[PDB]
Amino acid sequence: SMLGERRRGLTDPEMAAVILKALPEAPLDGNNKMGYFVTPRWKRLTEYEALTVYAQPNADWIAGGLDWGDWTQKFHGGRPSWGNETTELRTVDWFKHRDPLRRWHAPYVKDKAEEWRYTDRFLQGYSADGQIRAMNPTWRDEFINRYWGAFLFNEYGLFNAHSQGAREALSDVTRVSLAFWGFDKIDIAQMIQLERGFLAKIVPGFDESTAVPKAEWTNGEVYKSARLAVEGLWQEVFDWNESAFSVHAVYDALFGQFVRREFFQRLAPRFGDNLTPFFINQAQTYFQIAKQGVQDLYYNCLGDDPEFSDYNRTVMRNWTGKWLEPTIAALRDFMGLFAKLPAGTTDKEEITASLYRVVDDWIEDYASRIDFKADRDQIVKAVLAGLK
Amino acid sequence: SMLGERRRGLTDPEMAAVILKALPEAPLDGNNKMGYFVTPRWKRLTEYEALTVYAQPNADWIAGGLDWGDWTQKFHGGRPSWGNETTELRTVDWFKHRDPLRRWHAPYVKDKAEEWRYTDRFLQGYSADGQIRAMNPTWRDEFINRYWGAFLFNEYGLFNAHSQGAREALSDVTRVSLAFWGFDKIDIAQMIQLERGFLAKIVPGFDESTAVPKAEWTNGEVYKSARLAVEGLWQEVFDWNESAFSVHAVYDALFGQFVRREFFQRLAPRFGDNLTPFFINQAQTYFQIAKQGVQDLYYNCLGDDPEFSDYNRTVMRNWTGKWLEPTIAALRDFMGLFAKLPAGTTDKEEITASLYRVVDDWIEDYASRIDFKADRDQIVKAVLAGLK
Amino acid sequence: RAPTSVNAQEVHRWLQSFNWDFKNNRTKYATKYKMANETKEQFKLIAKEYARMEAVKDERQFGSLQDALTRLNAGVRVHPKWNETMKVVSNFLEVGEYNAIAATGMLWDSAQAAEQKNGYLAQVLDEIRHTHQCAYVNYYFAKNGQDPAGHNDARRTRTIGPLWKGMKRVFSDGFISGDAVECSLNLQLVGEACFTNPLIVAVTEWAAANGDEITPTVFLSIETDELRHMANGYQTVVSIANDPASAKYLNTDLNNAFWTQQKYFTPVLGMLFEYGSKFKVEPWVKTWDRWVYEDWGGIWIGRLGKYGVESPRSLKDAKQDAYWAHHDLYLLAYALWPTGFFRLALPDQEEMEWFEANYPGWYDHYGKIYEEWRARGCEDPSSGFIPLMWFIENNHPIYIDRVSQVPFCPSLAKGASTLRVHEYNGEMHTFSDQWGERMWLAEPERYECQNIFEQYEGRELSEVIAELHGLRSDGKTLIAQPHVRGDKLWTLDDIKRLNCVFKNPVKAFN
Amino acid sequence: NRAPTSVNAQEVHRWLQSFNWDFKNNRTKYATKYKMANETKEQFKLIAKEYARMEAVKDERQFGSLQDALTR
Amino acid sequence: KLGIHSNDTRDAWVNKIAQLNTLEKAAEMLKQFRMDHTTPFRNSYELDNDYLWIEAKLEEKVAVLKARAFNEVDFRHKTAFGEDAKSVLDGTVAKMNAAKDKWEAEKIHIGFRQAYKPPIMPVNYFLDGERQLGTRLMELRNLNYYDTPLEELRKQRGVRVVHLQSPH
Ligand SMILES: [Ca+2]
Ligand SMILES: [Ca+2]
Ligand SMILES: [Fe+3]
Ligand SMILES: [Fe+3]
């Protein structure tokens, strides 16, 4: 039937007439702002805040909670659905955090979706333009396939480190941010495979199988300590803030930045590789996006908590010390890769300067925020020892 | 008021009832397919064709027109709104063309919009990540600001070269493509300036003014034959098809490609510059997009026209030959840029390879389509004569 | 290392310097004016920001159409009369959108200052978006409406009728044929500023009243782009205001542009509003007066006064011929209903009372005529009657203005009834007003458009229709109809049997 | 050769299962009586990017309807 | 067999152009065809409903033959008649800028089109003359456009007034 069988109250004459009859003359309340009771971070409440803050049904016994009473059903043994006991950090209100980029689900998948289609056009343009012709063979088959490839497992591991946090985060704003930090990591790992998959299509003989990159990661030396650090951050940490903080304000800020930016982004161009930098651009953009959120949660909200500032900085300084050593070990082993490069690619001075760049940025963007007394030359000295 | 004063026929009980009573029992025609009479280029009629083909009100006296009679109003003198007299090319149907990418306005702005936002994000990441620290000052302050900047006028000129074609195109499918080929060109020009504007923001004494790169274009020696060739393709050509064919299938395919992909897209990486390549990736993506359309029109449609194949091919070989000389000249002058690069940047052996790359792809992508027997060796050698 | 970027304005800052000087750097089009090469544009846009702002509007629009609107069966719950009216409104407006693309392409070539070229360029792309948007409306009503015929093939079926010719004059040829500036005045200064801008919004109003939520969704999106085009027209005058040639030709090219546009829209737009709807929003006489006299003629043109622009000298003359213009036209439109690609309906009782109330004297002329045709069976295919026969029987020849292509019957009209017939080098010419007559006398080679009577002379009606595919899917029933009901639709045979043959009305003066 | 080419979600997903590796402590952090098979597979071959695109397409229609036609 | 897009008179001219096998004959037939059937100055209006379509079918034949005959430099710079494009172009513009009035100017422009409209003259020179000629034509015509009353204007155009009717 052209009109259909179902009658709709919005358009059915008889039904709408009944609905219009029962309507009041004007709204029963003029406060038409959902979330009007939320303390705005900025001048005016944002769509991000309204749709997010207080979605988590926390009771007042979990700092910042508006509900009351115990949970309705807990774990065998009595463990609460969500509780203070899942993290060492303390605060006046777990809902204070704000993603500086104000990312709720819709804006998040919109941007990643643009990047997906933009990526598809790039690869089609790259392949049709035959830009692969000028890429150094050795760099392609050895360093991209094996070493860049192995790095996917590092990012994948860092992605998984977020599983417990997704479940334990003590507020909506924190959970959403943590979920997004983790989703970008798996995305980067998949973009590394994507590149290998692309190369297998435009370069005869290139094998996209993960076997080689995986054997490098699991049994090689260059990434031995990195893997050991990742397995630790992922499976040995049961505190969701220690995991998020250590991963983002320690390990990935030092090791991750060095590998992605100082090694591949820096050297790929010297071998006629514009392909890898395309994907590293996305990784670096994601890294900087996460940094804003990480800094807000740990420095702005917790490290500067009006009641627990000193306590929280003590705890974070502890974690920084706990994980700085394994991160140094990771960088130290990675130093072994420089020996694999063709003679004349780079030298000890370039490597050292790039190391100081990463360490100096880390001290600026993180260490100093909690008063962690980092010794840049002592840190670089320790790592350089890995140079063969 | 809450309900408003305007009554709507879809929701108002009284009006809707009146409309419902007038409705036929079922659709008065089962053919609910707009554009059903258009000959599909593919298995099924696409939205692209339905919404585009035959929008242009041409009468049958213009190959393919479905209307009849003269135009209602013409130019003083008698010149027709649109007419066969505006291009040497002839065809059995001006509506045969089909953008292989099937781009109507919606998809077009969707893709470009994604690119604009992708770009903004990349720039915020790049600036926050301090990647500018690894760029060679000479390359930035001289080869980017002056020589890259100057190239923006080249692209800008090719952009305007499309102005007349936007007015004279003899069909909707050709006019849409042409319009998009030109709009992408001005975009490229605005991106070269955006990069210079970005650099001005993150580099203390960097001047974004087009003063320097402009004087280079207008008075320099490297782009002298380039500018003279552009001024020609744009203002001395009055045939819309010669203009588009000669710009995309001759000049920009050889000169434009060498400058973008073989010079800046190949050397920039060697100077710690991943910024310029980000923007060149778009230009190259665009070039490849446009080329698929340039090829469908002049080769699939005109060059292989069931009636004017030989004719059109003779006209294009004539245009190819006509503009191939000013193009090779543009390349020669450009060659004088290498002698300005720091010693050891590149050698005559590499450039000779890149020249054969541009020339061979050209012979493969355009020349061999209209049977313009071209000589790679003679061309390359003619260009190399510009070296220091 | 703070996150940094660069916006459109920051790049547009240097756009003006993008163009450089060289001997042959000049327009390729004939023009009497000189556009100043330092003219600026209002909106500081670059290709990418432009795409983004438009992509955002597309999202809402298509999201509404594909989701909520489709779920509400919005394509169907529209009054039959309006479903038909939109076949003409959307497709006819589509060509105006399409030629505006070429026009602004010509204007972009005409501009010397980079910023002015950029302004015209934004419109080029906008006119492209609008072309596809109008196309989508017909595409949508075809896919989901109560009658796809016409909506689905207007691009070819519009060629059968006479109303299309005049539309091409003000929406196609008038936009691209002549001095670049004359075209700018037809398109932007008059067309868009005086008519289309207010019209597009008006159409969304009449659509809403008749149950059409599809058109408002699209046309309201189109509307958001028109300010850039207003500016383009305004900037065209600012660009030539300083050239002495301007004081010699602007006020004439404009007056000619004003007459050209109003000549078609005054009767056509009023006709479509009042006769192609069931529920009314406002009497056209009131609307027209406000648009042309108050808003445009007064406010708009007034601001260009400092630029030497004056009210069209033919303005008061436009207001005199206006009052009954649209009522006179529908009589011809309906009498010739078999040449259209849409279904027409005669006014109902409520409607005739509305007309008489707003147009005293309406009933005694048009009303009685419509009831006569109906009682005679013009709606019934077995009657053997088509209103065109009534015109012949009562010796009321219908002519086509050689210049505007607008149909007129001076013998019956309640409005203008002047008629000028001339012969030149073996060809006859019919004119309906003094302004159009002058245009042809001065520029005879600009106006050689053959009318339907000339093309169809000696041909039997059903054959013209069949040849130009004026049939529905079954290959027998006419697309066009003398009523909007579901039963008793006319077929090609019902027409063939009338043995109606076309004659050139001007030959009676031989 | 030099034909416009790319890579889709399924193509990458074919190797997702290999992303995980073995190590002493690779085990769930939560108490459970069950043991989820180490080689269990999933029905949909998605990757972050593709998941984002397919959901963004839905949001487009949803919010467009809400902000445009439904509001009007 | 009558018809708008397909009719006997059109099928007639197609067989007629098909007989052309010389750029000379072809070019000449197009030149004459334009003298007899186009512009308000046409020798007759007998082909009024098909001349537009026929002219184009004639231009095609001429264009092809011109391509198979002319060399690269000629196809780009000389008319189908042998004339040197730029010469004609520069000469016509001279006559136009010398034209004493709009009546003289209009004849120069119209005649230029009937004679050199492609494939006769090369499009580049042709459209180049179109911008120059048209500019001069409009400048003379649009000057004091309304000064001449219609009664006098009709006498100037030399039209044969067959009927006038005006209630106001
Ligand atoms: Ca060194
Ligand atoms: Ca120290
Ligand atoms: Fe528009
Ligand atoms: Fe517009």
CA distance C244 to C253: 15
C469 labelled ligand-binding: no
CA distances from residue E94 to B238, C245, E98, E136 in whole angstroms, order as listed: 21, 21, 6, 11
CB C305 within 8 A of CB C367: no
CB B89 within 8 A of CB B245: no
CB C88 within 8 A of CB C275: no
Axis crossing angle, helix B224-235 with helix B309-334, rounded to the nearest 10:
150
Is B59 in a helix, a strand, or coil? strand
CA of A348 to the centre of ligand 1 (A): 8
Homologous superfamily of A1-388: Ribonucleotide Reductase, subunit A (1.10.620.20)
Rounded to the nearest 5 degrees, what angle is found at the Cα of B128, between the Cα atoms of B126 and B133?
65
C483 labelled ligand-binding: no
Residue type at E36 in one-letter notation = D
CA distance C1 to A257: 15
C365 labelled ligand-binding: no
CA distance E110 to E106: 6
Residue of E nearest to C458 (CA): E2
273-312 of A, contacting B, C-beta below 8 A: 273-274, 277-278, 281, 284-289, 291
Distance from chain centroid for Cα A149? 19
| C-alpha neighbours within 13 Å on the C-beta side of residue E151 | 0
154-173 of A, contacting B, C-beta below 8 A: none
CA distance C157 to C380: 23
CB atoms B88 and E113 under 8 Å: no
Those residues with Cβ within 8 angstroms of residue E107's Cβ, 6 or more apart along the chain or in another chain: none
CA distance A191 to A309: 39
Q: What letter does residue C450 receive in the DSSP assignment?
A: P
CA distance C154 to B4: 36
CA distance C211 to C79: 6
Smallest Cβ–Cβ distance between A128 and the set B20, B26, B288 belongs to B288
CA distance C361 to A111: 63
Those residues with Cβ within 8 angstroms of residue B344's Cβ, 6 or more apart along the chain or in another chain: none
Residues with CB under 5 A from ligand 3 (ion): C 97, 130
CA distance B268 to D46: 36
Ligand at shortest distance from the CA of A345: 1
CB C232 within 8 A of CB C109: no
CB atoms A197 and D7 under 8 Å: yes
CB atoms D60 and C62 under 8 Å: yes
CA distance E82 to E74: 8
Alpha helices in B129-223 (DSSP H): 137-138, 149-160, 163-168, 172-202, 211-219
CB atoms A4 and C77 under 8 Å: no
Which of D57, D38, C447 lies closest to A106 in space, CA to CA?
D57
With tokens 């019957």, the residue in question is C409
CA distance C12 to C22: 23
Smallest Cβ–Cβ distance between B86 and the set E122, E127, E138 belongs to E127
CB C83 within 8 A of CB B19: no
The alpha-carbon gap from B84 to the nearest alpha carbon of chain E, in Å, equals 7
Smallest Cβ–Cβ distance between E40 and the set C444, C458, C467 belongs to C444
Pairing mode of beta strands C399-400, C407-408: antiparallel
CA of B222 to the centre of ligand 3 (A): 43
The alpha-carbon gap from C210 to the nearest alpha carbon of chain A, in Å, equals 13
CB A251 within 8 A of CB A331: no
| C-alpha neighbours within 13 Å on the C-beta side of residue C463 | 16
Chain D interface includes A219 (CB < 8 A):
no
- Interface with chain A: mutation pick from D10, D13, D23, D66, highest number of A CBs within 10 Å: D23
**SS (HEC) of chain E:** CCCCCCCHHHHHHHHHHCCCCCHHHHHHHHHHHHHHHCCCCCCCCCCCCCHHHHHHHHHHHHHHHHHHHCCHHHHHHECCCCCEHHHHHHHHHHHHHHCCCHHHHHHHHHHHHHHHCCCCCCHHHHHHHHHHHHHHHHHHHCCCCCCCCHHHHHHHHCCEEEEEECCC
Chain E interface includes B239 (CB < 8 A):
yes
CA distance C63 to D63: 7
C443 labelled ligand-binding: no
H or E stretch at C130:
helix C114-144
CB atoms D68 and C67 under 8 Å: no
CB atoms E164 and C419 under 8 Å: yes
Instruction: Specify the length of chain D in residues.
Output: 72
Q: Is A58 left (phi over 0), alpha (psi -120 to 50) or beta?
A: beta
CA distance C467 to C485: 26
E84's tokens: 């040197």
Question: Which chain A positions have a beta carbon within 8 Å of D4's beta carbon?
Answer: 124-125, 127-128
CA distance B255 to B253: 6
Where b means 16+ CB within 10 Å and e means fewer, C158-170 reads: bbbbbbbbbbbbb
CA distance C187 to C190: 6
Class of residue C322 by CB neighbours under 10 A (exposed 0-12, middle 13-18, buried 19+): buried
CB atoms A183 and D48 under 8 Å: yes
CA distance A306 to A216: 47
Bridge partners, residue C407, by sequence: C400
B84's tokens: 């066969």
Neighbours of E118 (CB within 10 A): 25
With tokens 């309640």, the residue in question is C414
Chain B interface includes C445 (CB < 8 A):
yes
CA distance E29 to D52: 66
Chain B interface includes C25 (CB < 8 A):
yes
- Catalytic sites of C, residue numbers: 134
| Phi, psi dihedrals of residue C460, rounded to the nearest 5° | -85, 135
The alpha-carbon gap from B40 to the nearest alpha carbon of chain E, in Å, equals 23
Those residues with Cβ within 8 angstroms of residue B273's Cβ, 6 or more apart along the chain or in another chain: A269, B135, B136, B139, B140, B144
The method of structure determination was X-ray
With tokens 């209002």, the residue in question is C42
The alpha-carbon gap from E39 to the nearest alpha carbon of chain B, in Å, equals 7
CA distances from residue E114 to B71, C290, E13 in whole angstroms, order as listed: 17, 47, 19
H or E stretch at C476:
none
Chain A interface includes B134 (CB < 8 A):
yes
CA distance A181 to A193: 19
| Phi, psi dihedrals of residue C403, rounded to the nearest 5° | -85, -60
Which of C30, A230, D57 lies closest to B75 in space, CA to CA?
C30
CA distance A182 to A166: 9
What structural domains and CATH numbers belong to chain E? 1-69 (1.20.1280.10), 70-142 (1.20.1280.30)
CB A146 within 8 A of CB A213: yes
What are the structural domain ranges in chain B?
1-388
Which of C408, C431, C435 lies closest to C318 in space, CA to CA?
C435
Neighbours of C455 (CB within 10 A): 16
CA of C123 to the centre of ligand 4 (A): 7
With tokens 């009369």, the residue in question is C81
Q: Would you list the DSSP string of C36-75?
A: -TT---SS---HHHHHHHHHHHHHHHHHHIIIIIHHTTTT
CA distance C326 to C324: 6
Instruction: Specify the length of chain A in residues.
Output: 388
**SS (HEC) of chain A:** CCCCCCCCCCCCHHHHHHHHHHCCCCCCCCCCCCCCCCCCCCCCCCHHHHHHCCCCCCECCCCCCCECCCCCCCCCCCCCCCCHHHCCCCCCCCCCCCCCCCCCHHHHHHHHHHHHHHHHHHHHHHHHCCHHHHCCHHHHHHHHHHHHHHHHHHHHHHHHCCHHHHHHCCCHHHHHHHHHHHHHHHHHHHHHHHHHHHHHHHCCCCCCCCHHHHHHHHHCCCCHHHHHHHHHHHHCCCCHHHHHHHHHHHHHHHHHHHHHHHHHHHHHHHHCCCHHHHHHHHHHHHHHHHHHHHHHHHHHHHCCCCCCHHHHHHHHHHHHHHHHHHHHHHHHHHHHHHHHCCCCCCCHHHHHHHHHHHHHHHHHHCHHHHCCCCCHHHHHHHHHCCCC
CB B290 within 8 A of CB B178: no
Bridge partners, residue C423, by sequence: C428, E160
Q: Would you list the DSSP string of C342-371?
A: SB-----HHHHHHHHHHSTTHIIIIIHHHH
CA distances from residue B283 to A273, B115, B274, B326, E50 in whole angstroms, order as listed: 18, 12, 15, 22, 47
Question: Which chain D positions have a beta carbon within 8 Å of A224's beta carbon?
Answer: none
Residue type at A207 in one-letter notation = D
CA distance C429 to C437: 9
Q: Check the CA dihedral C375-C377-C383-C388 and report its sign.
A: positive
Pairing mode of beta strands C427-431, C419-424: antiparallel
Which of C214, B26, C147, B29 lies closest to A4 in space, CA to CA?
B26
CA distances from residue B357 to B262, C415, D59, E145 in whole angstroms, order as listed: 9, 73, 45, 61
CA distance A18 to B38: 48
The alpha-carbon gap from A286 to the nearest alpha carbon of chain B, in Å, equals 8
332-371 of A, contacting B, C-beta below 8 A: 357, 361
The top-level CATH class assigned to C1-510 is mainly alpha
CB atoms B71 and C177 under 8 Å: yes
Which of B34, B111, B37 lies closest to B285 in space, CA to CA?
B111
